[PDB]
Symmetry: D2
Subunit: 424 residues, 4 copies
Amino acid sequence: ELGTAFFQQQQLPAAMADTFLEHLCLLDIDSEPVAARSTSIIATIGPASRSVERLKEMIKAGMNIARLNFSHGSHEYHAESIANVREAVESFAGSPLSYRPVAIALDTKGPPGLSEQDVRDLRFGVEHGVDIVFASFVRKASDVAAVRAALGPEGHGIKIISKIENHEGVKRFDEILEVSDGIMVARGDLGIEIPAEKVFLAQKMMIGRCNLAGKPVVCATQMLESMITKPRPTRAETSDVANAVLDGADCIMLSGETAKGNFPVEAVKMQHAIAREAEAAVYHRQLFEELRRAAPLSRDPTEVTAIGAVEAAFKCCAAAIIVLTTTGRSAQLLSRYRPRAAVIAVTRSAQAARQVHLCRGVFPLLYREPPEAIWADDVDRRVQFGIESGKLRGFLRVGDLVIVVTGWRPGSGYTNIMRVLSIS
Amino acid sequence: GTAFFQQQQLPAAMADTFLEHLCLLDIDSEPVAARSTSIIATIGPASRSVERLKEMIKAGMNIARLNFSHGSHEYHAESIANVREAVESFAGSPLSYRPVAIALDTKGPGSGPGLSEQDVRDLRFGVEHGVDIVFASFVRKASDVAAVRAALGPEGHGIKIISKIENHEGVKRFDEILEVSDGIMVARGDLGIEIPAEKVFLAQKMMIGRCNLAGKPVVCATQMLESMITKPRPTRAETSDVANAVLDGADCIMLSGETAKGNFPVEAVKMQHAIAREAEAAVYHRQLFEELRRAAPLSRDPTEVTAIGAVEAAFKCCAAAIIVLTTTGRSAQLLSRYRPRAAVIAVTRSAQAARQVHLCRGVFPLLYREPPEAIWADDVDRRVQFGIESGKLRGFLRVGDLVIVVTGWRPGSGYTNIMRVLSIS
Amino acid sequence: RADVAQLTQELGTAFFQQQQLPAAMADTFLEHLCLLDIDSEPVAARSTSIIATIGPASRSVERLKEMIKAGMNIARLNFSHGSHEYHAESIANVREAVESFAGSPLSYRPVAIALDTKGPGSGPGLSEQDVRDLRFGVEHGVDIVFASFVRKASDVAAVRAALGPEGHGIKIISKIENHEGVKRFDEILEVSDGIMVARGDLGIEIPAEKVFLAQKMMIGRCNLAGKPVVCATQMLESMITKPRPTRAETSDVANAVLDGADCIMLSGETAKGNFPVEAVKMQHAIAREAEAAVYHRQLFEELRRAAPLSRDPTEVTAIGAVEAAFKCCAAAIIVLTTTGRSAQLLSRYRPRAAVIAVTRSAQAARQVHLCRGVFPLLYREPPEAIWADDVDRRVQFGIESGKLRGFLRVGDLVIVVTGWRPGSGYTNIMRVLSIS
Amino acid sequence: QQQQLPAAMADTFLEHLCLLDIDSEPVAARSTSIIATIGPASRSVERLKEMIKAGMNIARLNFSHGSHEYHAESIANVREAVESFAGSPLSYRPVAIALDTKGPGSGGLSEQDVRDLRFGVEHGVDIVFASFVRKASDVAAVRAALGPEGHGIKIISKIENHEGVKRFDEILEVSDGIMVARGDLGIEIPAEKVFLAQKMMIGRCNLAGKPVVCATQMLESMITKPRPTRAETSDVANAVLDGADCIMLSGETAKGNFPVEAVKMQHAIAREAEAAVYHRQLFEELRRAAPLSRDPTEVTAIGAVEAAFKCCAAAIIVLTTTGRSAQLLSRYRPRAAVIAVTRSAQAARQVHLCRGVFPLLYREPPEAIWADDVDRRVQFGIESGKLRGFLRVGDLVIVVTGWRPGSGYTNIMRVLSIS
Ligand SMILES: O=C(O)CCNS(=O)(=O)c1cc2c(c(O)c1O)C(=O)c1ccccc1C2=O
Ligand SMILES: O=C(O)CCNS(=O)(=O)c1cc2c(c(O)c1O)C(=O)c1ccccc1C2=O
Ligand SMILES: O=C(O)CCNS(=O)(=O)c1cc2c(c(O)c1O)C(=O)c1ccccc1C2=O
Ligand SMILES: O=P(O)(O)OC[C@H]1O[C@](O)(COP(=O)(O)O)[C@@H](O)[C@@H]1O
Ligand SMILES: O=P(O)(O)OC[C@H]1O[C@](O)(COP(=O)(O)O)[C@@H](O)[C@@H]1O
Ligand SMILES: O=P(O)(O)OC[C@H]1O[C@](O)(COP(=O)(O)O)[C@@H](O)[C@@H]1O
Ligand SMILES: O=P(O)(O)OC[C@H]1O[C@](O)(COP(=O)(O)O)[C@@H](O)[C@@H]1O
Ligand SMILES: O=C([O-])C(=O)[O-]
Ligand SMILES: O=C([O-])C(=O)[O-]
Ligand SMILES: O=C([O-])C(=O)[O-]
Ligand SMILES: O=C([O-])C(=O)[O-]
Ligand SMILES: [K+]
Ligand SMILES: [K+]
Ligand SMILES: [K+]
Ligand SMILES: [K+]
Ligand SMILES: [Mg+2]
Ligand SMILES: [Mg+2]
Ligand SMILES: [Mg+2]
Ligand SMILES: [Mg+2]
């Protein structure tokens, strides 16, 4: 069977509670997290975190997305930081147990509309193959359309994460989210534009609306601020990280902590440690019930398969949901239901593998084998690749149950199958 | 379309509370889904003619009950032959053929402590004549079920045992009886004489709730449409009783004197069909599905895991049906236990499984008669297509509908593990 | 366990095994059903009123005394049959049987008198026979009118006009008997005092298999509105000739109570049947079992969630009193009322505690039988010089009568609902009292 | 539209979060008490007057620092600042005095703690924040050191290590309340686990109906900066959303450059966070988990809170001798302010430990007839309520009183229309 020890770990006694109050009362500091950390860490790359050797330590510590702030530096400076990130990432390609995709995100300087510097920085992003744009001071839907147009003929696959930094962006949130790939709660400017005591309301509202929409949301700025000069964070800082994860954030971010601080690697390690504890403390029973109740009926087979797979994973405490995805969409639709099971996304697209770090609980595996002539064999090889990588990484063991999500024919947009396998 | 959301009590289905769900029930909201609660009709002088049996099958009879408290082995053998003749008269059109189970209802222990010698002989008769189900009278403890199982011998291992709870001891030892039984019958006739009449509804509701929690079939029986033995229309209490048995969660409803000896056997079957269909649409699935999931324990069985995923998927897209391939009926039973609003169309080659799955609410059995294709994946597809073609002919499905298809990874029973979202073309 | 552990130690495990209390503590409706126990005996007084139709089999004073002791709370006179002279004699016999118990005020049981109209027939509105029967009702001091075939709001206005200026106090319960009445339900309920789900005609006017939907919908809407709802016709039909009912009949009575009906009715079962007293006894027995089986945890939660916010102090006091009664497993809620309204507002929240309504109005004492769980006590003493002392005497009358009738025991907690000044409409106080 | 009422009406917690509005202004009085540590930066009578106006409800004296003479002078300055507002009885704000012990250090009750606890009794302190409580016998030792004269002093056990967290239930059982002392807890257990201990202890205290304080580094950067970090405002808001009855300032008020601004910031955040509480789920869960009871004060409290929610009552006015009737109302977390009218100056100060309890110290002449005396204490609550902005003409209030004088007899709830 599973054993009594299994049910004492990852806050499983608190998970079985009948009320949110009882769930809190059952949280246990001795109940150790077992699942892989699912909230991605975005680290801003700057003077303190630029070297290839330092970047290798940040990747090992848990950095999933490298942020380049175009409010500072230059094209030449950021291109060198990007090259160093890619060199550090590819230094682990020799071993399957250490290689991890790392997304590259460009954060714009900001604005009467799209600034000349933003047009040129967005063009630099397309030319350097960036995965994501964190668009500063998005105030309305037309600001997103301008960023989308500036991404030109080659950059339509780049994700646009609109940064909400002022009163107008909060008030026009629904129209901005509708046309964006996701949102960043940019608390630095938000805390100066609106009263500081109201930022938590904007953060919780935007995270809840993004969770309802199934779109990624980033919590940002001053999460571990004191760690710019101190080796350990304050009590308010660790609670801020934990509460951003409990709020429903897909990603958490470090700015000055990694760009200029004295402890960049330790700041990444601290966010990794807290996120893992907070993810186990999520009250999935109410969260899943409310996400299902609020999500409308759907005739899209990817959406229908995703909810069935997440329900199946909860039923058997599945060690993972393995999904085949080319664009990342099938993995994103699983992630929106917040399964406790890790979502292992097997893809041939290097860009999709980097971009899916935006979605909580998605573990990308880039697959490079040549295509099989028999499509069903190519699918089976990718599914077994997900299982063998899962075994190698500690996600899975023989005897475990996994949920497998595929489609009936090749090409993006046909996901319609959920299977229960049993690991051999 | 807007019309879709006005039918089958869908406005009441979207309510946030059970009280508001009741307030939104609409007598003009017509039922669309096929009737999912099976009807058991007791065979007798009123329902023994082969031609009358054909009318009862068309009216909705799913299970024919043989009451061994009346008549000899020669009488029951003739009843079996007549039922089979009426059932097989429709086998020439495989897309519309309806299997009908045959249940043997034992005489019982009488004044004895356990299995009577007449019951031993009747049970052996049942095995020799290939009955599908045994309704075991006056089950008081787990050893009564073991005795019935032993009397069926090695040749009757596939026969379902439905324990009839008819007295105080059976109600008190319910948990141990349900554990070893395939299902239960709330036998209200004797129960209403053995315990105070005003307490029977508590025993009925409790046993139906516990069977629903266990995922095992439960039958509500006796005097449901009693006045229809002599009158063409039932009383207001009788229609209410049928509707409330379905709302309680009964998998099956039964007719005794109404079909065995009365003057309106076909009309009694038609009345139970009409009421059950209305009551099934009035079920508050939002609370029911939530509570069945919450109470059901975690499972490592792939059939169980696939079943809950398929039911969740069916609710998400308002699937017209869940088509499942099954050898023993188990994969269909595990879908049924989650009470989907979507019809569970079970395709099987086992004639016995097709008859027995009528015990599970919402399971529509289709008996597949074609010999196996050389390529197993093609044989599976042909059976799924047979489910689709039968569903289109019977009115379950139309082009454009979404259906959930439940299959397994290898031949043989026990390997269901796949759920697939399919658009009907 | 922790939510009931201290009270289980104080009241004992036997207390928590009775009146379906294990099923009452369940966290889901499914678990509540699984925990229903035929060995869990009902303890509370029967709260769903029984309406018995008075006719040839139940007319004599001696027979009526047996029916009052068996549990009849409302006597129905069907003006579709008999005559003015016949029904006046039945009414006099009912009053004689009722007043035979008036010698002991601390046990006297009021019985309401209801007139059921013949109806409009093939006409579009109020018939001439109904005008005469309604005038008879006012002249004979009837408490309630069961108005046949109500199809729209103007039908109830016509009944109200026919009762004249002297019948303003008479309750109008509109009978819903056809498709139009069901479709125009909301406008009818708005102007009526309550509703009767008259299933006999309803089962002929709409498909028989749809009556349960109309019954459950109308009971739910009346529960939401806080207005009385009666379930009627063929509930124990076979008992017209047999001494025991069918399994569908007991189920029907139990399910009408579980649906939320305030009253249940007997027609031919008491008017002409061989076993009128046994039919009343059977409805009494089933209703007590079914009331205990109600899942109060979900019901109370849903009644609060659906009921809008209120600035009426009687309404605010009523929900606070019902919440307080549930918190301590109160034996009873004693309320002082002039019109019955404060008791009706307590009843709408469906407390498990009996609502003992102390009133000086003989008519209000009879009419409150329409509201589930209201036990009327007619106070006959002249007013004390100091109003606060008069209030206290009335509360003590409720306590002493409660102890004498078996509702209250020493050590019990009772909730007492009173107002801040004399006259109807000023209830605003809730008190927790320990019985000594 | 105000006080996050659109988010309050939501059918799910997720929809409640989606409906939170930065333009929906808080209207209710700030419910979560602020504990400020008094030290070099906040000692003067003039500075203490500004801290009282900014919202300080409890003055903490940390006996790990200073001396008996130093802390006695701080206490005298607190009392002088508090009494400077006594000339207007309808607006006077009581302020509690809390002694935080040095602790056991090496190893039961230290000899320094015995002397400091004696000092506390002699100086009439209201509360003891007992450091490093790891078992029930630590609480008994503190209680014994307070002697027969300190029977009325509240003991709030500070949970600062692994043992205190593991033996939480036995500690809470014998304590008046708890302090989640995150400074030591954050080095005694892994820093990334403190939030689990905080949320668990707050939840268990809420279930028990006993006060819980969130403490340490809440607005840390404000020791040198005029504005806090984004993590610090979030931390204050989340402690209130977690269910904390009190929030605390240590170095921020004891030695920092912006003590008054730190108090103002905690006041501003707490008020916003209290309106963002999802009362629909919270009341339902507290009401479901609170055990059945035959105690009339407990029965009246749930009836009164239910009644207040039904009519959107502006306040629940309660008469209390010890603070207990107000504490039992507070445990159900009403949105309505609990205005507690008491003659006990000590109970008025101590009741700041319970969220949403606004103490009014009654100093009007006694009425000859007890029923009239009760009525004038109720009218005093109404007049103070109107002057402070809690109540207006036309509002509905719930009034909670007892049937006889003396503590322990609360059994009446009344619905009253203002003016
Ligand atoms: O708004 C602010 O002032 C805070 C910005 N927070 S940050 O995005 O993490 C940030 C980014 C950067 C730096 C920071 O110290 C810093 O803190 C640099 O010194 C720097 C120097 C030269 C080239 C590039 C960088 C650079 O990219
Ligand atoms: O027709 C219907 O659907 C209603 C019948 N159900 S009843 O209202 O209870 C009912 C009422 C009555 C009778 C009934 O047999 C009867 O059954 C009488 O014989 C009778 C005889 C003489 C005077 C008066 C009555 C009299 O009032
Ligand atoms: O970090 C800790 O270990 C706790 C310190 N946080 S505190 O309790 O608020 C605190 C308290 C005090 C001081 C602080 O600077 C301080 O910060 C003093 O300078 C001081 C000087 C002279 C007499 C008394 C005090 C005095 O009481
Ligand atoms: O998430 P996406 O981008 O829609 O991709 C999902 C697709 O992946 C598959 O599972 C496998 O497709 P490929 O063989 O083309 O990679 C498809 O059946 C399904 O449509
Ligand atoms: O419900 P059961 O009895 O377990 O049968 C389900 C079985 O039916 C199938 O779908 C088809 O099997 P067969 O081809 O042997 O009929 C299997 O893959 C699966 O194991
Ligand atoms: O339920 P009703 O009709 O409003 O009557 C309640 C009234 O009864 C009382 O309790 C007593 O009033 P009386 O003294 O006039 O009988 C009033 O204080 C209260 O307003
Ligand atoms: O909250 P506590 O300490 O029990 O005090 C409540 C007490 O206060 C009162 O309302 C007023 O009593 P006093 O007149 O003695 O102040 C009592 O009736 C009640 O018992
Ligand atoms: O731009 C940002 O990241 C901010 O303002 O927090
Ligand atoms: O045997 C039966 O069916 C009964 O007693 O109801
Ligand atoms: O009128 C009635 O009572 C009926 O039709 O049921
Ligand atoms: O003593 C304290 O307050 C601490 O350690 O946080
Ligand atoms: K920027
Ligand atoms: K039999
Ligand atoms: K009539
Ligand atoms: K200290
Ligand atoms: Mg910014
Ligand atoms: Mg029998
Ligand atoms: Mg009629
Ligand atoms: Mg400490």
